[PDB]
Design a protein around this motif. Structure first.
Motif, PDB file in Angstrom:
ATOM      1  N   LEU A  28      42.923  53.545  19.735  1.00 16.48           N
ATOM      2  CA  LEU A  28      43.156  54.598  20.126  1.00 16.48           C
ATOM      3  C   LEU A  28      44.781  55.009  20.344  1.00 16.48           C
ATOM      4  O   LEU A  28      44.663  56.187  21.228  1.00 16.48           O
ATOM      5  CB  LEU A  28      43.515  52.893  21.358  1.00 16.48           C
ATOM      6  CG  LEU A  28      44.028  53.445  22.869  1.00 16.48           C
ATOM      7  CD1 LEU A  28      43.171  54.704  23.662  1.00 16.48           C
ATOM      8  CD2 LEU A  28      44.708  52.326  23.890  1.00 16.48           C
ATOM      9  N   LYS A  29      45.337  55.045  19.675  1.00 14.56           N
ATOM     10  CA  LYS A  29      46.536  55.491  19.694  1.00 14.56           C
ATOM     11  C   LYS A  29      46.040  56.851  19.163  1.00 14.56           C
ATOM     12  O   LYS A  29      47.153  57.850  19.945  1.00 14.56           O
ATOM     13  CB  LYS A  29      47.576  54.703  19.218  1.00 14.56           C
ATOM     14  CG  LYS A  29      49.189  55.766  19.246  1.00 14.56           C
ATOM     15  CD  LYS A  29      50.182  55.590  18.089  1.00 14.56           C
ATOM     16  CE  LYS A  29      52.028  55.976  18.554  1.00 14.56           C
ATOM     17  NZ  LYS A  29      52.518  55.573  19.481  1.00 14.56           N
ATOM     18  N   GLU A  30      45.249  57.123  17.904  1.00 14.69           N
ATOM     19  CA  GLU A  30      45.158  58.354  17.645  1.00 14.69           C
ATOM     20  C   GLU A  30      44.190  58.421  19.040  1.00 14.69           C
ATOM     21  O   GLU A  30      44.318  60.291  19.088  1.00 14.69           O
ATOM     22  CB  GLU A  30      44.621  57.920  16.616  1.00 14.69           C
ATOM     23  CG  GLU A  30      44.480  59.472  15.324  1.00 14.69           C
ATOM     24  CD  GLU A  30      45.602  59.965  15.083  1.00 14.69           C
ATOM     25  OE1 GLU A  30      46.166  59.811  15.348  1.00 14.69           O
ATOM     26  OE2 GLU A  30      45.165  61.807  14.825  1.00 14.69           O
ATOM     27  N   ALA A  31      43.636  58.330  19.378  1.00 17.47           N
ATOM     28  CA  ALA A  31      42.693  58.809  20.372  1.00 17.47           C
ATOM     29  C   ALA A  31      43.281  60.026  21.087  1.00 17.47           C
ATOM     30  O   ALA A  31      43.080  60.463  21.412  1.00 17.47           O
ATOM     31  CB  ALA A  31      41.182  57.525  20.601  1.00 17.47           C
ATOM     32  N   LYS A  32      44.081  59.211  21.206  1.00 18.27           N
ATOM     33  CA  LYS A  32      45.482  60.251  23.094  1.00 18.27           C
ATOM     34  C   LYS A  32      45.883  60.672  22.025  1.00 18.27           C
ATOM     35  O   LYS A  32      45.860  61.829  22.893  1.00 18.27           O
ATOM     36  CB  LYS A  32      46.313  57.986  23.155  1.00 18.27           C
ATOM     37  CG  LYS A  32      45.523  57.211  24.324  1.00 18.27           C
ATOM     38  CD  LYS A  32      46.360  56.565  23.623  1.00 18.27           C
ATOM     39  CE  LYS A  32      47.651  56.064  25.112  1.00 18.27           C
ATOM     40  NZ  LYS A  32      48.729  54.775  25.020  1.00 18.27           N
ATOM     41  N   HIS A  33      46.143  60.351  20.256  1.00 15.18           N
ATOM     42  CA  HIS A  33      47.465  61.640  20.182  1.00 15.18           C
ATOM     43  C   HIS A  33      45.914  62.780  20.026  1.00 15.18           C
ATOM     44  O   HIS A  33      46.568  63.778  20.688  1.00 15.18           O
ATOM     45  CB  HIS A  33      47.841  61.203  18.961  1.00 15.18           C
ATOM     46  CG  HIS A  33      48.858  60.549  19.308  1.00 15.18           C
ATOM     47  ND1 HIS A  33      50.157  60.333  20.023  1.00 15.18           N
ATOM     48  CD2 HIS A  33      49.587  59.106  18.434  1.00 15.18           C
ATOM     49  CE1 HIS A  33      50.831  59.271  19.558  1.00 15.18           C
ATOM     50  NE2 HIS A  33      50.154  58.281  18.725  1.00 15.18           N
ATOM     51  N   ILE A  34      44.739  62.206  20.528  1.00 16.37           N
ATOM     52  CA  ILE A  34      43.763  63.548  20.042  1.00 16.37           C
ATOM     53  C   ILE A  34      43.995  64.310  21.776  1.00 16.37           C
ATOM     54  O   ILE A  34      43.820  65.633  22.058  1.00 16.37           O
ATOM     55  CB  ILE A  34      42.411  62.952  19.054  1.00 16.37           C
ATOM     56  CG1 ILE A  34      42.889  62.904  17.534  1.00 16.37           C
ATOM     57  CG2 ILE A  34      41.808  64.421  19.030  1.00 16.37           C
ATOM     58  CD1 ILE A  34      43.336  63.523  16.932  1.00 16.37           C
ATOM     59  N   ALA A  35      43.416  62.952  22.672  1.00 15.71           N
ATOM     60  CA  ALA A  35      43.933  63.809  23.781  1.00 15.71           C
ATOM     61  C   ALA A  35      44.598  64.069  24.036  1.00 15.71           C
ATOM     62  O   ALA A  35      45.181  66.122  24.277  1.00 15.71           O
ATOM     63  CB  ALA A  35      43.342  62.422  24.899  1.00 15.71           C
ATOM     64  N   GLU A  36      46.043  63.220  23.029  1.00 15.61           N
ATOM     65  CA  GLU A  36      47.035  64.415  23.934  1.00 15.61           C
ATOM     66  C   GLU A  36      47.003  65.791  23.335  1.00 15.61           C
ATOM     67  O   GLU A  36      47.790  66.876  24.035  1.00 15.61           O
ATOM     68  CB  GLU A  36      48.670  64.108  23.138  1.00 15.61           C
ATOM     69  CG  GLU A  36      49.444  64.775  23.474  1.00 15.61           C
ATOM     70  CD  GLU A  36      50.986  63.756  23.026  1.00 15.61           C
ATOM     71  OE1 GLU A  36      50.927  62.851  22.258  1.00 15.61           O
ATOM     72  OE2 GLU A  36      52.081  64.102  22.965  1.00 15.61           O
ATOM     73  N   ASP A  37      46.452  66.180  21.502  1.00 17.11           N
ATOM     74  CA  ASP A  37      46.326  66.932  20.860  1.00 17.11           C
ATOM     75  C   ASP A  37      45.621  67.916  21.413  1.00 17.11           C
ATOM     76  O   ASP A  37      45.084  68.918  21.168  1.00 17.11           O
ATOM     77  CB  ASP A  37      45.599  67.009  19.518  1.00 17.11           C
ATOM     78  CG  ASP A  37      46.168  68.373  18.566  1.00 17.11           C
ATOM     79  OD1 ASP A  37      46.765  68.440  19.047  1.00 17.11           O
ATOM     80  OD2 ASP A  37      45.318  68.240  17.751  1.00 17.11           O
ATOM     81  N   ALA A  38      44.386  67.992  22.111  1.00 21.20           N
ATOM     82  CA  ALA A  38      43.560  68.216  22.908  1.00 21.20           C
ATOM     83  C   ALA A  38      43.686  68.210  23.982  1.00 21.20           C
ATOM     84  O   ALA A  38      43.097  69.938  24.152  1.00 21.20           O
ATOM     85  CB  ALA A  38      42.329  67.417  23.038  1.00 21.20           C
ATOM     86  N   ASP A  39      44.318  68.237  24.250  1.00 25.26           N
ATOM     87  CA  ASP A  39      44.820  68.727  25.831  1.00 25.26           C
ATOM     88  C   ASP A  39      45.019  69.403  25.540  1.00 25.26           C
ATOM     89  O   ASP A  39      46.204  70.324  26.205  1.00 25.26           O
ATOM     90  CB  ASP A  39      45.155  67.723  26.716  1.00 25.26           C
ATOM     91  CG  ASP A  39      44.220  66.789  27.501  1.00 25.26           C
ATOM     92  OD1 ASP A  39      43.358  67.511  27.851  1.00 25.26           O
ATOM     93  OD2 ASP A  39      44.783  65.273  27.377  1.00 25.26           O
ATOM     94  N   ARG A  40      46.557  69.011  24.296  1.00 27.97           N
ATOM     95  CA  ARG A  40      47.883  69.947  24.107  1.00 27.97           C
ATOM     96  C   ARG A  40      46.999  71.445  23.083  1.00 27.97           C
ATOM     97  O   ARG A  40      47.573  73.123  23.423  1.00 27.97           O
ATOM     98  CB  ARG A  40      48.165  69.627  22.577  1.00 27.97           C
ATOM     99  CG  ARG A  40      49.757  70.198  22.276  1.00 27.97           C
ATOM    100  CD  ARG A  40      50.443  69.739  20.909  1.00 27.97           C
ATOM    101  NE  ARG A  40      50.698  68.410  21.266  1.00 27.97           N
ATOM    102  CZ  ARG A  40      50.567  67.442  21.294  1.00 27.97           C
ATOM    103  NH1 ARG A  40      49.823  67.727  20.293  1.00 27.97           N
ATOM    104  NH2 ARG A  40      51.004  66.685  21.378  1.00 27.97           N
ATOM    105  N   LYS A  41      45.769  72.235  22.667  1.00 26.57           N
ATOM    106  CA  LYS A  41      45.237  72.966  21.932  1.00 26.57           C
ATOM    107  C   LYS A  41      44.599  73.589  23.242  1.00 26.57           C
ATOM    108  O   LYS A  41      44.856  74.678  22.761  1.00 26.57           O
ATOM    109  CB  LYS A  41      44.491  73.249  21.285  1.00 26.57           C
ATOM    110  CG  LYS A  41      42.964  71.493  21.742  1.00 26.57           C
ATOM    111  CD  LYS A  41      41.666  71.359  19.831  1.00 26.57           C
ATOM    112  CE  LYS A  41      42.507  70.669  19.614  1.00 26.57           C
ATOM    113  NZ  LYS A  41      41.032  69.908  19.039  1.00 26.57           N
TER     114      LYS A  41
END
Lengths: 55, 55
Positions: A28-41
């Motif tokens: 989840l932390k990674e999925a959140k970080h992917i969301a942060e990254d996904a939102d970041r990209k």
């Protein structure tokens, strides 16, 4: 035997659920970080869209 | 008749006494077996508590 087997089945289940808990929590932390990254990209490209759009 | 009754009363006494002795043996055997059933019971109950406590 049933309360002990139960305890062991439950310990096994508790462990499966504990691992799934930690696995899903770490992931989840990674999925959140992917969301942060996904939102970041998204923001980097969307911002380019805005910049290019502003231009 | 008194003499035969005596031989028979003496026999009855012999048999009654044989029965006192045979029963004393048996009473004692049931008392000993009872103590054993009670000891086995205390044991079964302690084991029951251990098994139930394990449960």
């Amino acid at each position: 035997d049933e309360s002990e087997r139960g305890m062991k089945v439950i310990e096994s289940r508790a462990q499966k659920d504990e691992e799934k808990m930690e696995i899903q929590e770490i992931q989840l932390k990674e999925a959140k970080h992917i969301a942060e990254d996904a939102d970041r990209k998204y923001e980097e490209v969307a911002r380019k869209l805005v910049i290019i759009e502003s231009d | 008749d008194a003499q035969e009754k005596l031989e028979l009363a003496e026999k009855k006494a012999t048999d009654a006494e044989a029965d006192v002795a045979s029963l004393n043996r048996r009473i004692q055997l049931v008392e000993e077996e009872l103590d054993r059933a009670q000891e086995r019971l205390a044991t079964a109950l302690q084991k029951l508590e251990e098994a139930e406590k394990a449960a």
